[PDB]
């Protein structure tokens, strides 16, 4: 099988390289970790959540991650380039929580234990040695949408501050509607942007009086500020065509990543449709996310790519 002859056959193309971020394209780079390397990393279902966490397996640009101390049916994919994972000894040097491995926390200590060898640091993308997102301080407050529930736009607080990402947490809530963003993102907004559209705001989680809140007593009785409306920037819609095709990583498991078409459009969704496959598999994904990737990616960083059915 071949891009080529599948191509060709198929009288399609394939989505340029150019409508994808650099994160999602890139090829070039080895993926420096090896097996049984422990890290620090956000738990995907959590992603305020850091734990210790063990390689237990790589493939191609990809590694997929053990969490140690739990089971492993927890385990997920990340790319080498993530950055919502981070060289051990980094939850301390920056003011974040960790997560003991289960029954626990020293790294020199669990390094002696284990005799594991931490990932070293030169691999990671994202050290929080980098420029800040700008007028996006911890503890600001903004209105966010449910990316879960999206026609909820809701009160919410930036919690957390890596690099060039924010953490938008959906207050009163626990944090699996939390997502990380930078500026540009398409589902923030700024206080009093609901009130200004004609859209109602979710109050958070409970707050007494759901039927009196207000930015202004609210801002002042939780002692906040509000990011500032300067910071939010605007993330022009890209430029994915329908019946493009590209490779895309299967959902219902994510070690396996497939031949792809572009099925719908949005300003900054796309629909995924695996060629072959039924329609009721078709997804969502952000046109951002770091799991689609052009064709030839697959080939050209060594992970394997399932043809269409």
Known sequence: ???????????????????????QAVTHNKNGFKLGMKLEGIDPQHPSMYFILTVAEVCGYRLRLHFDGYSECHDFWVNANSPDIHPAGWFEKTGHKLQPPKGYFSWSQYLRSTRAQAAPKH????????????????????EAVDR????????????????????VHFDNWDDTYDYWCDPSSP?????????????????????????????????????????????????????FLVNMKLEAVDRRNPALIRVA????????????????????????????????????????????????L
């Open 1 to 23: 099988w071949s891009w080529e002859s599948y191509l060709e056959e198929q009288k399609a193309i394939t989505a340029p390289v150019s409508l994808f971020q650099d994160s």
């Open 123 to 142: 691999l990671f993308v994202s050290q929080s040695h980098s420029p800040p997102p700008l007028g996006f301080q911890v503890g600001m407050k903004l």
């Open 148 to 167: 879960m529930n999206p026609s909820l736009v809701c009160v919410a607080s930036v919690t957390d501050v890596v690099d060039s990402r924010f953490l």
């Open 187 to 239: 589902y923030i907004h700024p206080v009093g942007w609901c009130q200004k559209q004609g859209k109602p705001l979710t109050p958070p989680q409970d707050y007494p009086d759901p039927d009196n809140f207000c930015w202004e007593k609210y801002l002042e009785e939780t002692g906040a500020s509000a990011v500032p409306t300067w910071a939010f920037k605007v993330r022009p819609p890209h430029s």
């Open 261 to 308: 078409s572009v099925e719908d459009v949005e300003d900054h969704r796309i629909k995924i449709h695996f060629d072959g496959w039924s329609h009721g598999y078709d997804f969502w994904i952000d046109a951002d996310h770091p799991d689609i990737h052009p064709a030839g990616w697959c080939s050209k960083t060594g992970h394997p790519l399932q043809p269409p």
